[PDB]
Symmetry: C2
Subunit: 299 residues, 2 copies
């Protein structure tokens, strides 16, 4: 049972490089617009405390160097929407897929196509943490990389990368430029709220483990939804809602293990630990598979 | 840090479906040839003791349905190379990347583009285990899915998927149709040999720990390669080759820690416990990161 990302071809065809002065990052080229983080307009000193409206009014179209592969795209207009820059170019992207911009909820997962200098480097799965950070793998030059999901032929962009926090987790925006969480695109020390574990994802992962024949954690204890949530909150786990119980339905039907019975198993794992044992090869409870991810891969 | 698949766009542009009768799997369309597992020509009941030579002599070009989506590609030639069928088609794939066919070593990693009916569904990183199985995620209809690496612009194809073993692990061929390991494309009882830990990959992960400042496990000892190999086998670890010592070279130089000094530190971790301590946030030693995976992820190769 592997973390599986969506195939990245439809997004690779949209990645371009954007440069102002000596700052380079990636942009997303859809039709005749390039989207990219607005701090590409910042000098290093600017990043320390940027007034973005002041910085942008002092820029001209020709200050923006956009390159798709080797070919420069001429910028013929620009505007700012929250923390993203929209650069109008004189060329439409022939590889533009069917797409939408979405704002995802904490606990939901998405694929990240990490790019440098407008070129794709790697693909992997993430989840929006409850504290609105993401545990990514991003280096210098990765800003403008996007997170996405794919449904039929339609790409749902949900994330664009802006920054790394001092703990090593990452922060970014939706494609309307609004940050996930209480962060700002300024180079200054920023902490996140206390993170919590995505409970419904842990349960779905436990179902995946049972589907693969790893059952040592199951028990015959019973629990009400409320009593499970009390223990969950005590251990910094997110509350389980009845809709969460409902979306776990298909997995409970396939395994013959009632959702609340899987809650009883998890509750004992939280109170006793995993001893020295593993689940699906993991020494920790994994919470970045949604119920949909598990069903998608195990059925 | 995490496992990272290569961008799959170059391979996605090469996936097609191949059907004989009601048996459909995936094929790889490069230039004017489609490569796919030869058991597509098997009826459900002939997979028990298939005579592939006699099944293929019954087939003509017009029995093969090759589709890029719903667009049919005309087959103009067919031949069998080991366990792979090569179907010549009348159209050269305009999306053919620069490519090569490679046969990889146990321990080497690769991305897998899992496909169904020629439609890509997901991408993930896999390692070839020392027992020549891979711990994949393959369902019915995934055969013909390929595994690959990308270096600059060139796709090295190294795996094509054929079968699942009783323990839920998977087996397949290189793109010349030669199985990895002692497996055969027959629906009979087969079993993976007992697996071992990929020592060169564990060492790469230790180097990655050191690069990140996590170095409590460095000791003041060294060892010889031969003594380390003999001890490692006692813990079900693979022995190191001279090539293994050399591909750790870049990480040894970056950290300043000699390969054999890192071998002695790992030997201590094997003989003693981890003392309830962690390495890169893990109580387990990771063995599915090659030296190349460490470099490319730690320095962001495109």
């Amino acid at each position: 049972f592997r973390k599986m990302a969506f195939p990245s071809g439809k997004v690779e065809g949209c990645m371009v490089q954007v440069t102002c002065g000596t700052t380079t990052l990636n942009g997303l080229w859809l039709d005749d617009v390039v989207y990219c983080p607005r701090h590409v307009i910042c000098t290093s000193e600017d990043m320390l405390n940027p007034n973005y409206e002041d910085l942008l009014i002092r820029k001209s179209n020709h200050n923006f160097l956009v390159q798709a592969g080797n070919v420069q795209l001429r910028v013929i207009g620009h505007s700012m929407q929250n923390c993203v820059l929209k650069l109008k170019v004189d060329t439409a992207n022939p590889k533009t897929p069917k797409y939408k911009f979405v704002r995802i909820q904490p606990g939901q997962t998405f694929s990240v196509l990490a790019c440098y200098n407008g070129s794709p480097s790697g693909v992997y799965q993430c989840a929006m943490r409850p504290n609105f950070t993401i545990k990514g793998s991003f280096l210098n030059g990765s800003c403008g990389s996007v997170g996405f999901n794919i449904d039929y032929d339609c790409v749902s962009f949900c994330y664009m990368h802006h920054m790394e926090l001092p703990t090593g987790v990452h922060a970014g925006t939706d494609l309307e430029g609004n940050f996930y969480g209480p962060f700002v695109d300024r180079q200054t020390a920023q902490a996140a709220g206390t993170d919590t574990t995505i409970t419904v994802n842990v349960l779905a992962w436990l179902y995946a483990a049972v589907i693969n024949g790893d059952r040592w954690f199951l028990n015959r204890f019973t629990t009400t939804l409320n009593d499970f949530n009390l223990v969950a909150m005590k251990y910094n786990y997110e509350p389980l809602t009845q809709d969460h119980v409902d979306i776990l339905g298909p997995l409970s039907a396939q395994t013959g293990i009632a959702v609340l019975d899987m809650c009883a198993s998890l509750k004992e794992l939280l109170q006793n630990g995993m001893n020295g044992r593993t689940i699906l090869g993991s020494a920790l409870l994994e919470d970045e598979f949604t119920p949909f991810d598990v069903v998608r891969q195990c059925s």
